[PDB]
Amino acid sequence: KKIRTSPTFRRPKTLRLRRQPKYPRKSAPRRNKLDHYAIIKFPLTTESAMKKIEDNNTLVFIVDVKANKHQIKQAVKKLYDIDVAKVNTLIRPDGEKKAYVRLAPDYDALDVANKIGII
Amino acid sequence: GAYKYIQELWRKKQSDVMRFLLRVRCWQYRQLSALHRAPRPTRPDKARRLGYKAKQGYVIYRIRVRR
């Protein structure tokens, strides 16, 4: 005794189960190949880069194209034990990403450059 | 056995019974899609003679081809 209110007959919602595989498709997860060491290739030591470092309290790095601003900021913080104010990324006409990492005013970009070795 | 009787029945296609059955089956099949999976054979005797076996793994598809 269930009356049809509407003339249309939609497909009834049937129960659907989740995935319960008998065995994983892959034995182990693939190790991440975008770690903090792989993401950052090398800093730039050009005259413009040094002027940028000594004027705007920032740093210049070469990063893979696949990296995001969040990834670059986290990688810089993890590697150099520094706080990043912001990140500005661009792609040079060569295939390598250039990243201007503007640091927080508390830390000294020239001191960080001295520590990392570029001057 | 029933299979020989079924074979003779299918051989006597011009009879009224077989004519009615063929007409009803043709109408039902034409009312369906051009390729749908039949769950059981329409002609068990013909299926057995052609090699169909009533065991898992055997499938039967009914196909409508334009004349």
């Binding site: 049809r4 003339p7 249309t8 | 056995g1 029933a2 009787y5 299918w10 009615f20 009803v24 068990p44």
Partner: protein, 241 residues
């Protein structure tokens, strides 16, 4: 007083151009799926078309009380299921050499399930009563069988539901069943069932052969033609007398 005067009536007039119609039943106007539509109009076609007697004979089904009696009688002769043949085999294995067991003893009479087996034993004239399901999807399986049983003098009856017939056996569906042998205790009941079945089926198989069935039009068309016939009867029904 326990009725607040603020309680009004506010009736709804469900007319044309008035308040909208209520949510009533619309099952007659549902756009049913193609398979439902096909399975309904197939039954409509079976009712409409002039069905040959060889297929129409299965519309003559067994009555409720006789069906219940036959099912009760066959309940004793239902075949052994799984986990029972295993028990019998293990019992015979343990009794092979435990108490001087030659294992020739006896096997009880059992029902016959397959159409091939039933046909073979009907042609051999070993059957005493054969039950045939009326709802086999391919009717080609059993059309000859009532005629063969009538020719061989084997009482045949038609039951409703291949599912019900195959529930006596331990499977899903079964087209035919046969009483090859029965116990002496149930011999009288089997004879009563046999005579009741042959009174209704075998003794009038000529009528069954000659009984075509069909030409049953839809109720709307029947009502229209009945109205036309009543009008033509009233044309000269009271004027002349």
């Amino acid at each position: 007083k326990v009725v607040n005067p603020l309680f009004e009536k506010r009736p709804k007039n469900f007319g044309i151009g008035q308040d909208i119609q209520p949510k009533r039943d619309l099952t007659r106007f549902v756009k049913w799926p193609r398979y439902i539509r096909l399975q309904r109009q197939r039954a409509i076609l079976y009712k409409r078309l002039k069905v040959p007697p060889a297929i129409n004979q299965f519309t003559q089904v067994l009555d409720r009380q006789t069906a219940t009696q036959l099912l009760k009688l066959a309940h004793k002769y239902r075949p052994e299921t799984k986990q029972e043949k295993k028990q019998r085999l293990l019992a015979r294995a343990e009794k092979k050499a435990a108490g001087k067991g030659d294992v020739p003893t006896k096997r009880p009479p059992v029902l016959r399930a397959g159409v091939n087996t039933v046909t073979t034993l009907v042609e051999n004239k070993k059957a005493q009563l054969v039950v045939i399901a009326h709802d086999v999807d391919p009717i080609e399986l059993v059309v000859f069988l009532p005629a063969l049983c009538r020719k061989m003098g084997v009482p045949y009856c038609i039951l409703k539901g291949k599912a019900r017939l195959c529930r006596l056996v331990h499977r899903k569906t079964c087209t035919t069943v046969a009483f090859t042998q029965v116990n002496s205790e149930d011999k009288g009941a089997l004879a009563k069932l046999v005579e009741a079945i042959r009174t209704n089926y075998n003794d009038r198989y000529d009528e069954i052969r000659r009984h075509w069935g069909g030409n049953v039009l839809g109720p709307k068309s029947v009502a229209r033609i009945a109205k036309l016939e009543k009008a033509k009867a009233k044309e000269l029904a009271t004027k002349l007398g």
